[PDB]
Design a protein around this ligand. Structure first.
Ligand SMILES: Cc1c(C#N)cccc1-c1cc(-c2cn(Cc3cccc(C(C)(C)O)n3)nn2)nc(N)n1
Ligand SMILES: CC(C)CCC[C@@H](C)[C@H]1CC[C@H]2[C@H]3CC=C4C[C@@H](O)CC[C@]4(C)[C@H]3CC[C@]12C
Ligand SMILES: CCCCCCCC/C=C/CCCCCCCC(=O)OC[C@H](O)CO
Ligand SMILES: CCCCCCCC/C=C\CCCCCCCC(=O)OC[C@H](O)CO
Ligand SMILES: CCCCCCCC/C=C\CCCCCCCC(=O)O
Ligand SMILES: CCCCCCCC/C=C\CCCCCCCC(=O)O
Ligand SMILES: CCCCCCCC/C=C\CCCCCCCC(=O)O
Ligand SMILES: CCCCCCCC/C=C\CCCCCCCC(=O)O
Ligand SMILES: CCCCCCCC/C=C\CCCCCCCC(=O)O
Ligand SMILES: CCCCCCCC/C=C\CCCCCCCC(=O)O
Ligand SMILES: CCCCCCCC/C=C\CCCCCCCC(=O)O
Ligand SMILES: CCCCCCCC/C=C\CCCCCCCC(=O)O
Ligand SMILES: CCCCCCCC/C=C\CCCCCCCC(=O)O
Ligand SMILES: CCCCCCCC/C=C\CCCCCCCC(=O)O
Ligand SMILES: CCCCCCCC/C=C\CCCCCCCC(=O)O
Ligand SMILES: CCCCCCCC/C=C\CCCCCCCC(=O)O
Ligand SMILES: CCCCCCCC/C=C\CCCCCCCC(=O)O
Ligand SMILES: CCCCCCCC/C=C\CCCCCCCC(=O)O
Ligand SMILES: CCCCCCCC/C=C\CCCCCCCC(=O)O
Ligand SMILES: CCCCCCCC/C=C\CCCCCCCC(=O)O
Ligand SMILES: CCCCCCCC/C=C\CCCCCCCC(=O)O
Ligand SMILES: CCCCCCCC/C=C\CCCCCCCC(=O)O
Ligand code: NA
Length: 450
């Protein structure tokens, strides 16, 4: 068996798996409305680039592995086309990372800023930028436009990737600026996502989950100006009047904007007032005195939502809370009008009473980042599959007199880069239930017919 035949077979097998697997990804998104979110718009765009890897880029790499004679501009397209697909993948991976950070940073206002129309515009722009970046050698930055391989006739060059694509482009422009910098930005974004889910939980973070945190002055449900965690500023219909109240409480001219620490200090003063009002109430003080620090925060949470008078009306639940009958107090509180009006917030507060822990709010944070862990794996696989080729290009560039990397390492690094166009659909099937369920439906019904 020829050594070339095993390289062709492996490349064609990767191409088939890249097409079939990523067609299934787009097919699943088109079929399942539950998969038609903005995050999957970039997943589809990422899959579209991987489909093109198996249809064009991999056949292109096979032809230029021979170094045949061809025109300069025509040879550059065959060599630089995969640079367009890889750049579009980087933009799609960077967009997914930023999208998931917005999802955990402003989880209540995520859908107002992140829209489908905006995503399609970003995708269309990034594809234009990917062609400009990937096909930069065709616009002049090439090595076949200067008079001087030999044995091909003039106007024709030996179509080898390292012969026609400049190495300083492959290292400075492509690797350092267009690959390494986005990969490091994606690393910091995902790190920042994971740290926010691992944040310390307290009364400030609990109410931030229940009532939101806003550092800019906004209008509440009643049209009144608010800041921080539900801190009413004024009933007046003047933002200037609200800013004057905000500046009087912060101690600095804010122009309606405050820092997170100032919102925490403002919220801390609101807790002190709610605690002062609880202690002066003869119904609430005995219960509050008996509760632990966490369960006291759940009682303050109720006061912030309904008021001391409204909480004092829970005569039966308050006595069972004071008697440390957590499970009995949970059943009683669940049968209240407060539970029916806002069950999600009530269930989190009731769970706090049962356990005395922050588990209900920790689980809220963990649910917001579970998708980010799977999508972060895809970025690491992209880095793992492409960095060997980049590092070698650096060795050839910065050590010209060095011995070039051996042929088997070239074949391995190039094939490993093509393999990355296969791994993503497997990740979706293994870690995303909605993708896995649609994959099974398409396969069992549309493909296998039964
Ligand atoms: C494109 C790219 C990106 C992107 N986008 C990012 C980093 C690096 C690269 C990249 C790619 C190729 C390449 C060469 N070939 C044809 C080929 C196939 C098999 C064997 C051979 C031999 C005989 C060894 O020359 N040649 N296919 N890709 N070569 C180099 N230095 N870098
Ligand atoms: C540590 C990482 C994140 C940043 C450093 C960039 C790395 C990837 C680049 C920058 C400089 C590069 C070169 C530094 C110097 C050497 C020596 C030279 O005989 C060949 C390559 C080689 C080995 C390069 C290796 C890769 C290289 C180290
Ligand atoms: C994250 C995914 C991990 C899975 C990916 C693992 C690494 C990629 C597989 C390489 C095997 C094929 C590499 C060898 C290339 C073909 C064999 C060859 O080199 O033949 C050329 C011959 O020497 C001259 O014609
Ligand atoms: C024609 C387009 C559709 C062709 C599809 C057949 C070709 C499969 C190719 C690549 C695998 C794709 C990535 C792996 C997806 C597997 C999903 C799956 O089967 O998961 C269900 C299983 O029951 C879990 O337990
Ligand atoms: C997944 C299934 C992939 C099946 C095979 C891919 C095509 C193999 C054809 C080998 C031809 C190469 C040659 O003979 O030179
Ligand atoms: C040859 C290049 C083929 C490129 C990709 C073809 C499929 C593009 C993905 C769009 C699918 C539409 C959708 O899933 O909503
Ligand atoms: C190899 C290139 C051709 C294969 C890639 C493109 C085909 C797969 C694309 C996505 C499948 C689901 C989207 C198709 C939309 C069909 C439109 C319609 O039927 O109304
Ligand atoms: C080869 C060139 C392929 C270019 C990109 C195909 C279109 C991008 C995939 C569709 C994204 C829009 C969407 O899914 O909503
Ligand atoms: C999955 C669809 C794409 C596959 C079909 C495209 C055909 C394959 C492309 C060219 C393979 C053979 C041409 C180059 C021969 C290389 C000669 C050599 O190995 O030295
Ligand atoms: C699924 C179908 C995929 C088709 C892949 C086609 C592969 C084409 C590979 C290179 C063929 C030569 C193209 C460049 C020649 C132009 C330069 C010249 O004429 O000198
Ligand atoms: C798909 C086709 C995309 C564009 C191909 C452009 C080729 C660049 C110039 C070709 C040189 C030549 O004719 O030999
Ligand atoms: C799925 C179908 C994809 C459509 C494109 C098919 C493959 C195109 C391959 C590259 C052609 C462009 C490279 C050289 C162009 C000049 C060649 C010439 O003019 O004869
Ligand atoms: C232009 C290339 C650089 C952009 C790469 C990706 C950056 C955007 C990432 C996706 C964010 C998700 C959609 C949010 C829409 C942005 C809101 C707006 O238009 O200001
Ligand atoms: C040559 C054609 C190459 C691929 C065209 C892909 C662009 C059109 C599909 C867009 C998918 C969509 O958003 O509906
Ligand atoms: C000679 C080389 C010719 C290069 C042609 C490429 C120029 C067109 C730019 C990108 C085409 C891919 C379309 C992707 C945008 C559709 C995504 C969307 O808006 O939903
Ligand atoms: C068209 C959208 C915006 C495009 C800007 C980014 C794409 C890259 C554009 C061209 C880069 C050219 C870099 C010039 C390097 C020196 C030229 C040379 O030495 O030959
Ligand atoms: C995706 C983000 C892309 C950012 C592109 C802008 C950054 C470009 C930075 C410089 C790269 C090239 C540095 C030296 C130019 C080559 C010198 C020459 O040969 O003329
Ligand atoms: C981050 C982007 C880094 C871009 C390049 C840094 C080094 C630039 C040196 C240019 C050398 C000029 C040349 O290539 O001839
Ligand atoms: C250095 C360039 C960038 C390298 C890739 C950057 C993306 C890293 C993203 C997250 C890594 C994978 C996260 C999966 C969690 C598994 C637990 C673990 O092993 O750490
Ligand atoms: C060198 C570029 C490193 C980029 C990392 C940016 C910080 C990460 C972040 O906070 O988003
Ligand atoms: C891990 C990826 C390391 C890639 C190997 C670089 C070898 C350097 C060389 O052989 O010139
Ligand atoms: C994360 C696991 C993804 C598995 C994808 C398949 C790996 C092997 C890739 C192609 C094999 C070609 C021989
Ligand atoms: Na890709």
């Amino acid at each position: 068996i020829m050594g070339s035949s095993v390289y062709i077979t492996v490349e064609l097998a990767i191409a088939v798996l890249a097409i079939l697997g990523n067609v299934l990804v787009c097919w699943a998104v088109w079929l399942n409305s539950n998969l038609q979110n903005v995050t999957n718009y970039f997943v589809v765009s990422l899959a579209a680039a991987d489909i093109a890897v198996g249809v064009l880029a991999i056949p292109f790499a096979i032809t230029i592995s021979t170094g045949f004679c061809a025109a300069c501009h025509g040879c550059l397209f065959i060599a630089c086309f995969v640079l367009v697909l890889t750049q579009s993948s980087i933009f799609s991976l960077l967009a997914i990372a930023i999208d998931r950070y917005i999802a955990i940073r402003i989880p209540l206002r995520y859908n107002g800023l992140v829209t489908g129309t905006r995503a399609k515009g970003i995708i269309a722009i990034c594809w234009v930028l990917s062609f400009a970046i990937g096909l930069t050698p065709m616009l002049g930055w090439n090595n076949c436009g200067q008079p001087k391989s030999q044995g091909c006739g003039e106007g024709q060059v030996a179509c080898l990737f390292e012969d026609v694509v400049p190495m300083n482009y492959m290292v400075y422009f492509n690797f350092f600026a267009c690959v390494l910098v986005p990969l490091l930005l994606m690393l910091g974004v995902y790190l920042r996502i994971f740290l926010a889910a691992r944040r310390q939980l307290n009364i400030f973070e609990m109410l931030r989950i229940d009532e939101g945190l806003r550092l800019k002055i906004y209008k509440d449900t009643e049209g009144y100006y608010t800041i921080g965690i539900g801190h009413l500023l004024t009933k007046s219909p003047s933002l200037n009047a609200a800013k004057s109240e905000l500046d009087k409480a912060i101690g600095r001219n804010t122009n309606g904007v405050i820092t997170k620490d100032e919102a925490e200090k403002l919220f801390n003063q609101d807790v002190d007032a709610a605690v002062r009002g609880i202690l002066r109430n003869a119904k609430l003080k005995p219960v509050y005195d008996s509760l632990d620090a966490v369960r006291r925060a759940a009682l303050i949470n109720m006061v912030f939502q309904m008021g001391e008078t409204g909480v004092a009306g829970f005569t039966n639940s308050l006595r069972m809370l004071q008697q440390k009958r957590w499970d009995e107090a949970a059943v009683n509180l669940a049968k209240s009008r407060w539970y029916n009006q806002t069950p999600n917030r009530a269930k989190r507060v009731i769970t706090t009473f049962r356990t005395g822990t922050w588990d209900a709010y920790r689980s809220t944070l963990q649910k917001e980042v579970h998708a980010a862990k799977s999508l972060a794996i895809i970025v690491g696989l992209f880095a793992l599959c492409w960095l060997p080729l980049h590092i070698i290009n650096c060795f050839t560039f910065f050590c010209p007199d060095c011995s070039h990397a051996p042929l088997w390492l070239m074949y391995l690094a190039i094939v490993l880069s093509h393999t990355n166009s296969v791994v993503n659909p497997f990740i979706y099937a293994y870690r995303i239930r909605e993708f896995r369920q649609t994959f099974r439906k398409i396969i069992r019904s549309h493909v296998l017919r039964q």
